[PDB]
Structure formats: C-alpha cells, structure tokens
Symmetry: C2
Subunit: 99 residues, 2 copies
C-alpha cells in the first residue's frame, strides 16, 4: 500500500474553519476503489501544518480518485480555500503493525 499526505498550511486562527470544511467530506472518498482510509490530523507540536493522511492499496487507486470523483465532489462548492498552501507527501508502506 501507499500513503499520500496533503500537508496544508492554515493561517493563524483558521483551524476551526478548515476543520469544518472536512466535517461532511467522508462521502467524497469513502467508497472509492482501493481506498483504505483517511485521517485529518490537527497539529499540536513540532508541525504547523494540518496533515490529511490517506491510505491506498496502490498509487493508481489514488490517481483514479484524484482525477475523477475528487474533482466531481466540488460541484456546488466555492473554490475559495482557507488554506494558504499545500504540499503532497507520497510514501510506500514498508511496515504496518496493528495495536
């Protein structure tokens, strides 16, 4: 599997607004083929960016979602972001250990 993290820069005080924009977003991705899950991570120490951490069975599965269903999920939405920058961090899972 692969991990794709969108590391989002958020202006001071805009944390709650950004989090609210994610609150009903599950429908936009949860059903996608090869999707294994995602977490929105609020930074607490050592990082100022929010991490949107997504897990996929493959790179192609993420790309299919990004190029199709993800774009479609914007219909009817303002495209005015509160984030001031974003960086995509891509990784391959080399080890996974359960609780």
């Amino acid at each position: 599997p692969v991990v794709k993290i969108n590391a989002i820069e958020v202006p001071a005080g805009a944390g709650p607004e950004l989090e609210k924009r994610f609150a009903h977003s599950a429908h936009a991705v949860e059903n996608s083929p090869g999707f294994l899950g995602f977490q929105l991570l609020r930074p607490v120490k050592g990082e100022e960016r929010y991490f949107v951490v997504t897990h996929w069975e493959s790179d192609e599965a993420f790309q299919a979602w990004a190029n199709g269903p993800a774009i479609a999920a914007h219909a009817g939405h303002r495209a005015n972001p509160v984030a001031t920058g974003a960086s995509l961090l891509e990784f391959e899972v080399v080890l996974d250990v359960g609780g």
Copy 2:
C-alpha cells in the same frame, strides 16, 4: 486519539539497513496500553525523511511508552544509528474515515 510521527533522516543507501532494523521492532511497542498501531513509511516524492507514524488513544499512553518500554528496548543492542536526525510531529486526530 493522537498521532505521533517521528520523521527520521536517513543517508542515501541506509534505507535498507533502517528498514531491516524496523522489521524486527514490532515487539518493542505492540501490546503497550493505548497503542493503536504504527507504520514505517518510506518516502517516494515530496519528502526525504522516513515517517514513523504511530497511533495512540491518548498522549499519556504515548508518553508512558516513550518513557519506559521504548528506553528499555535498547538494552542489548550494539549497533550505531544510521539515522542522522529526527523530529517528532504531534497531532490530534480530528476526523477518521474508513475505506
């Protein structure tokens, strides 16, 4: 829950040695109270550091592990580190969505 990511810097070519070291490390953290799991992420694009992504029911559970077992787990090892630096990134899980 909380997420603690250790972002470790690894010289070129040490990736395999670092990964081999993590391959036999599950025992050092699994079963610890409040531990929910971890992944070793090998960087592919956008990042040069390995991400050690760990999940915990609370910060206290993470501190209890880091302060006791994790230290104890070094006893008997005679290898020098291959990592040259590390940064702990700490997060609160705000949203969790399963696939």
